[PDB]
Amino acid sequence: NVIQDLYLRELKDTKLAPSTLQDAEGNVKPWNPPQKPNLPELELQGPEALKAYTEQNVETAH
Amino acid sequence: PPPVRLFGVEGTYATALYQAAAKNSSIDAAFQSLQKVESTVKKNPKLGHLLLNPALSLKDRNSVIDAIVETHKNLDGYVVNLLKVLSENNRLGCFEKIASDFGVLNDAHNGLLKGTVTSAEPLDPKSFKRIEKALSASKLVGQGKSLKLENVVKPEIKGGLIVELGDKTVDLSISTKIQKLNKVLED
């Protein structure tokens, strides 16, 4: 009765209330990419270090 | 003890009066006299309803009783013994209350029931009659008991109806259904 009246009135006269996807974007964190793939620097590259190390520590093992 | 027990003081008076006059089997007489004295209180609207207020003594009160039986000595006499009692107990503010209460007990003894059809507006006489018939038809009025179904206007209850009698109600009203509906849409 009143159930029917409400059911009808409610459903018909506005089903959903307005919404916009564009507005949502502002209020949510946007995807942003990691910066740089990165490559590790060549650690202790070449015998520059070795020649230095042999001389630097010619320290024996006692 | 006589059917229907109205709990509460002043209805302890009514109960006593009722049971006493039921046991004296002179309830119609009592009722009639009670109506008459109630009427003569109402028809003594100033200076005998506006001096039911306490302030008067026992002795001044006794002279009020004398004035009451002076207005008509057509009183039952059991209700004159009740008048004396009320004077002695020094209350008479609830006098018409006791009368009304005796009325409930009395008309219960008669069997008469009262109902109600509260609505926002006075409904069809057809509705009134159909409901009275229906209630009499239904076990709700057991029969050997009568229904003074009274529609009352209560704009506060928006539309609808509530049928009332015997502390059993069926409430098909718009306000109540709306309440439940509002709630279900708060989910």
Curated annotation (Swiss-Prot), chain A:
Gene Ontology BP annotations: cristae formation; mitochondrial proton-transporting ATP synthase complex assembly; proton motive force-driven ATP synthesis; proton transmembrane transport
Domain of life where this protein originates: Eukaryota
This protein's UniProt keywords: ATP synthesis, CF(0), Hydrogen ion transport, Ion transport, Membrane, Mitochondrion, Mitochondrion inner membrane, Transit peptide, Transport
Compartments, record wording: Mitochondrion; Mitochondrion inner membrane
CC per GO annotation: mitochondrial inner membrane; mitochondrion; proton-transporting ATP synthase complex
Self-association state and partner proteins as the record states: F-type ATPases have 2 components, CF(1) - the catalytic core - and CF(0) - the membrane proton channel. In yeast, the dimeric form of ATP synthase consists of 17 polypeptides: alpha, beta, gamma, delta, epsilon, 4 (B), 5 (OSCP), 6 (A), 8, 9 (C), d, E (Tim11), f, g, h, i/j and k.
Function: Mitochondrial membrane ATP synthase (F(1)F(0) ATP synthase or Complex V) produces ATP from ADP in the presence of a proton gradient across the membrane which is generated by electron transport complexes of the respiratory chain. F-type ATPases consist of two structural domains, F(1) - containing the extramembraneous catalytic core and F(0) - containing the membrane proton channel, linked together by a central stalk and a peripheral stalk. During catalysis, ATP synthesis in the catalytic domain of F(1) is coupled via a rotary mechanism of the central stalk subunits to proton translocation.
Similarity remark: Belongs to the ATPase h subunit family.
Comment field (misc): Present with 6140 molecules/cell in log phase SD medium.
Stated name of the protein: ATP synthase subunit H, mitochondrial
Gene that this sequence comes from: ATP14
Curated annotation (Swiss-Prot), chain B:
Subcellular location(s) of the protein: Mitochondrion; Mitochondrion inner membrane
Transmembrane segments: none
Alphabetical GO biological process terms: proton motive force-driven ATP synthesis; proton motive force-driven mitochondrial ATP synthesis
Lineage: superkingdom: Eukaryota
GO MF: proton-transporting ATP synthase activity, rotational mechanism
Keywords from the named record: ATP synthesis, Hydrogen ion transport, Ion transport, Membrane, Mitochondrion, Mitochondrion inner membrane, Transit peptide, Transport
Any Gene Ontology CC annotation: mitochondrial inner membrane
One Pfam family from the record: OSCP
Role played: Mitochondrial membrane ATP synthase (F(1)F(0) ATP synthase or Complex V) produces ATP from ADP in the presence of a proton gradient across the membrane which is generated by electron transport complexes of the respiratory chain. F-type ATPases consist of two structural domains, F(1) - containing the extramembraneous catalytic core and F(0) - containing the membrane proton channel, linked together by a central stalk and a peripheral stalk. During catalysis, ATP synthesis in the catalytic domain of F(1) is coupled via a rotary mechanism of the central stalk subunits to proton translocation.
Note: Present with 32400 molecules/cell in log phase SD medium.
Record text on subunit structure and interactions: F-type ATPases have 2 components, CF(1) - the catalytic core - and CF(0) - the membrane proton channel. CF(1) has five subunits: alpha(3), beta(3), gamma(1), delta(1), epsilon(1). CF(0) has three main subunits: a, b and c.
Family note: Belongs to the ATPase delta chain family.
Protein name: ATP synthase subunit 5, mitochondrial
Species of the source: Saccharomyces cerevisiae (strain ATCC 204508 / S288c) (Baker's yeast)
